[PDB]
Amino acid sequence: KSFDDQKKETIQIIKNHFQCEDYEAEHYLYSNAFRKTYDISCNKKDRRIKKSDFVESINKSKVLFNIWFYQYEGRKEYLRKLKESFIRRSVNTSPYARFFILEFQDKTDIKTVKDCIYKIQSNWSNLSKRTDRPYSPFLLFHGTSDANLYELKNQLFNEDLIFTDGYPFKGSVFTPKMLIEGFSNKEIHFQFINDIDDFNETLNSINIRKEVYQFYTENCLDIPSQLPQVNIQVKDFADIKEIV
């Protein structure tokens, strides 16, 4: 039919089937259902499949990219459309241990990562001298070489963005408690989790509410399910700045 005509129809079957809210159905389940309809339509040989195993494919924790929702409404609406759905902000941002896991690949320039880090650090921290419970976001990167990761870490320190990684000196073992003190440290801007092994040891040392914001392009890491997560898939790393 028309573009508008089937828009109110297609979300109606998914709404009562899973019994979730509007953004958990129209934005979370209906968006993923459009790709895997197209993923088998563009298959060269097996075009028609049985949909018995389709209803559990799209109920993953992830929120996949929709290229047709990129091409129609453009990048201004779509990144705003993703921002308003899962990253609903409040006036008073509570001191929660927020983890920002971003996929790092060699096609990404080192300059645009810092502007994403500067956006995450400014929007998700309150390092004021007057607050009694200061908070600072956690940053995790994956998929890249350690040589490219250290160049990003070394560049941020020269621009007076002081961070901690659980490695306070050369040859140190991983100290998870340094990130907890850095969470309450007003002179530490954010925390830089080195890898996935340093990630899961950090959740065991934090007792306050923890949120995980995952922003990948191709590969998404397996996160524990009880943690509140937002796994948004994007085209490029520069799009992550306009959603956080």
Looking up tokens 């509570």 gives 94
Q: Which residues pair with 141 in a beta bridge?
A: 102
Secondary structure (3-state) at 102: strand
H or E element that contains 82: helix 74-86
Give the dihedral sign, CA 123/126/129/130.
Answer: positive
Using rule CB under 8 A, residue 91 touches other proteins: yes
Using rule CB under 8 A, residue 19 touches other proteins: no
Query: Residue 104 or residue 124: which is nearer to other proteins going by CB?
Result: 124
Stretch that binds other proteins, among 83-91, 155-163, 168-176, 194-202 (CB under 8 A): 83-91
Stretch that binds other proteins, among 60-68, 91-99, 172-180, 191-199 (CB under 8 A): 91-99
Looking up tokens 């309450």 gives 184
Distance in angstroms (rounded) separating the CA atoms of residues 2 and 93: 41
Using rule CB under 8 A, residue 76 touches other proteins: no
Distance in angstroms (rounded) separating the CA atoms of residues 121 and 124: 6
Distance in angstroms (rounded) separating the CA atoms of residues 32 and 204: 32
When binding is defined by CB under 8 A, the residue of 2, 16, 19, 90 that contacts other proteins is 90
Stretch that binds other proteins, among 52-60, 63-71, 128-136, 173-181 (CB under 8 A): 128-136
Using rule CB under 8 A, residue 51 touches other proteins: no
Using rule CB under 8 A, residue 215 touches other proteins: no
Using rule CB under 8 A, residue 155 touches other proteins: no
Stretch that binds other proteins, among 68-76, 80-88, 154-162, 188-196 (CB under 8 A): 80-88
Using rule CB under 8 A, residue 84 touches other proteins: yes
Stretch that binds other proteins, among 10-18, 21-29, 89-97, 221-229 (CB under 8 A): 89-97
Distances (CA, A) of 24 to 12, 73, 109, 169, 215: 13, 20, 33, 44, 18
Are 66 and 31 contacting, i.e. CB atoms less than 8 angstroms apart?
yes
Using rule CB under 8 A, residue 209 touches other proteins: no
How far apart are CB 90 and other proteins at their closest, in Å? 6
Query: Residue 36 or residue 119: which is nearer to other proteins going by CB?
Result: 119
Count how many residues are written for the chain: 244
Using rule CB under 8 A, residue 123 touches other proteins: yes
Using rule CB under 8 A, residue 170 touches other proteins: no
Using rule CB under 8 A, residue 7 touches other proteins: no
* 95 backbone dihedrals φ, ψ, rounded to 5°: -70, 75
**Cβ count near 137 (within 10 Å):** 23
Binding site for other proteins (CB under 8 A): 80, 83-84, 87, 89-93, 122-124, 126, 128, 130-131
